[PDB]
Amino acid sequence: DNIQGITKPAIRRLARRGGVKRISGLIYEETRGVLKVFLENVIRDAVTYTEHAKRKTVTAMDVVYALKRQGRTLYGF
Amino acid sequence: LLIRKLPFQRLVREIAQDFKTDLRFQSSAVMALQEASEAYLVGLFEDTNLCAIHAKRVTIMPKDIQLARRIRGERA
Amino acid sequence: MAKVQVNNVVVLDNPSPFYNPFQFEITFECIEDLSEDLEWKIIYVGSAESEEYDQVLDSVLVGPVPAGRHMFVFQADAPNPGLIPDADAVGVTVVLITCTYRGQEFIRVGYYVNNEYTETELRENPPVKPDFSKLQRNILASNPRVTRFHINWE
């Protein structure tokens, strides 16, 4: 609903860590929304490896292969 | 890790439900999710820095995050 | 397992007026001979708001593709401004090079593109309707984002 997983100071820290000097007040909602989607796409795909491989506990490695499946971005050739 | 673990854990679990109510994670799994989430959000913000430095626009806008998603391609 | 490896991309005639064609020198390698098709395309992101304003600028469909290393200059006409939202026309968007095997995207090479006016009057007092014939396109060639996707190469 309105449940969030990252705090506003958390967001400024990550922005700072990315080299961002200043941030619009509108960035908080957008960052969080972006984080909802990312998490959805990963968790959904991770549910596959647990449920079609029969288990009830999602392992560390359940998420790992789910992550390997998301497409990896590099910054050169 | 720059995100506190407990609130993130609640968000992961509430997402976990809406798919299927019966569902469980574990300490080291949810920590993997978080590690990725921080790396991804940071990646996203490094891109927004590329605009700012090249245009005349130091204050970052939702547009720029949207853009940084499109280049990667799970808006695709 | 990944049958096609993209080694390098070079952006050419850059910077340049907006109306100039894009020109990328792509170098890539095949490992097995290729049977099914290989499709390259350039997408111009018209607007960050929505995918509906993507313009697919060209598409090279190539096959069957012999094994080894190949190279080509992928030229493609500039986008149709008729379709770009005003607010987005000036400033930064994104071009994409994309490659598909058996209809599955396996690599996406993306660049930020900054369109600026050259004349300081236009820079200072930017017109209400963008004058594309006076926009210069600067592709940030030093900051590619290469994203690979695991695909079925079967």
From Swiss-Prot, chain A:
Location within or outside the cell: Nucleus; Chromosome
N6-succinyllysine modifications at: 8, 54, 68
A GO biological-process term: nucleosome assembly
Glycyl lysine isopeptide (Lys-Gly) (interchain with G-Cter in ubiquitin) crosslink site(s): 68
Residue numbers carrying N6-acetyllysine: 8, 36, 56, 68
PTM annotation (N6-propionyllysine): residues: 8, 21, 54, 56, 68
GO molecular function: DNA binding; protein heterodimerization activity; structural constituent of chromatin
Function: Core component of nucleosome. Nucleosomes wrap and compact DNA into chromatin, limiting DNA accessibility to the cellular machineries which require DNA as a template. Histones thereby play a central role in transcription regulation, DNA repair, DNA replication and chromosomal stability. DNA accessibility is regulated via a complex set of post-translational modifications of histones, also called histone code, and nucleosome remodeling.
Name of protein: Histone H4
Species of the source: Xenopus laevis
Taxonomic placement: Eukaryota, Metazoa, Chordata, Craniata, Vertebrata
Parent-record interval covered: 25 to 101 of 103
Swiss-Prot record, chain B:
GO-annotated cellular components: nucleoplasm; nucleosome
Residue(s) carrying Phosphoserine: 27
Post-translational modification: Acetylation is generally linked to gene activation. Acetylation at Lys-63 (H3K122ac) by EP300/p300 plays a central role in chromatin structure: localizes at the surface of the histone octamer and stimulates transcription, possibly by promoting nucleosome instability.
Positions where N6,N6,N6-trimethyllysine occurs in the chain: 20
Keywords: Acetylation, ADP-ribosylation, Chromosome, Citrullination, DNA-binding, Hydroxylation, Lipoprotein, Methylation, Nucleosome core, Nucleus, Palmitate, Phosphoprotein, Ubl conjugation
Disulfide feature: none
Modified sites of kind N6-glutaryllysine: 20, 56, 63
Residues with the N6-acetyllysine modification: 20, 56, 63
Modified residues (N6-lactoyllysine): 20
N6-(2-hydroxyisobutyryl)lysine sites (modified residues): 5, 20, 63
Modified residues (N6-succinyllysine): 20, 63
Positions of post-translational N6,N6-dimethyllysine modification: 20
Residues where lipid is bound covalently (S-palmitoyl cysteine): 51
Residues bearing the modification N6-methyllysine: 5, 20, 63
Location within or outside the cell: Nucleus; Chromosome
Gene Ontology molecular-function annotations: DNA binding; protein heterodimerization activity; structural constituent of chromatin
Regions crossing the membrane: none
Phosphothreonine modification, residue list: 21, 48
Family per similarity comment: Belongs to the histone H3 family.
Function: Core component of nucleosome. Nucleosomes wrap and compact DNA into chromatin, limiting DNA accessibility to the cellular machineries which require DNA as a template. Histones thereby play a central role in transcription regulation, DNA repair, DNA replication and chromosomal stability. DNA accessibility is regulated via a complex set of post-translational modifications of histones, also called histone code, and nucleosome remodeling.
Subunit organization: The nucleosome is a histone octamer containing two molecules each of H2A, H2B, H3 and H4 assembled in one H3-H4 heterotetramer and two H2A-H2B heterodimers. The octamer wraps approximately 147 bp of DNA.
Protein name stated in the entry: Histone H3.2
From Swiss-Prot, chain C:
Main subcellular location of this protein, as a coarse class: nucleus
Molecular-function annotations in GO: chromatin binding; histone binding; histone chaperone activity
UniProt KW keywords: Chaperone, Chromatin regulator, Chromosome, DNA damage, Nucleus, Phosphoprotein, Transcription, Transcription regulation
GO cellular component: chromatin; nucleoplasm; nucleus; protein-containing complex; site of double-strand break
Domain of life of the native organism: Eukaryota
Region annotated Interaction with histone H3, CHAF1B, and HIRA, chain positions: 1-154
Tissues with expression: Ubiquitously expressed.
Post-translational modification as stated in the protein's UniProt record: Phosphorylated by TLK1 and TLK2. Highly phosphorylated in S-phase and at lower levels in M-phase.
GO biological process, one term: DNA repair-dependent chromatin remodeling
Motif (Required for interaction with HIRA): 31-37
Cell compartment(s), UniProt: Nucleus; Chromosome
Function: Histone chaperone that facilitates histone deposition and histone exchange and removal during nucleosome assembly and disassembly. Cooperates with chromatin assembly factor 1 (CAF-1) to promote replication-dependent chromatin assembly and with HIRA to promote replication-independent chromatin assembly. Promotes homologous recombination-mediated repair of double-strand breaks (DSBs) at stalled or collapsed replication forks: acts by mediating histone replacement at DSBs, leading to recruitment of the MMS22L-TONSL complex and subsequent loading of RAD51.
Family designation: Belongs to the ASF1 family.
Oligomeric form and interacting partners: Interacts with histone H3 (via C-terminus), including histone H3.1, H3.2 and H3.3, and histone H4; the interaction with H3 is direct. Probably interacts with the heterodimeric form of H3-H4 taking the place of the second dimer. Interacts with the CHAF1A, CHAF1B and RBBP4 subunits of the CAF-1 complex. Interacts with CABIN1, HAT1, HIRA, NASP, TAF1 and UBN1. Found in a soluble complex with NASP and histones H3 and H4; the interaction with NASP is probably indirect and mediated by H3-H4. Interacts with CDAN1. Found in a cytosolic complex with IPO4 and histones H3 and H4. Interacts with CREBBP.
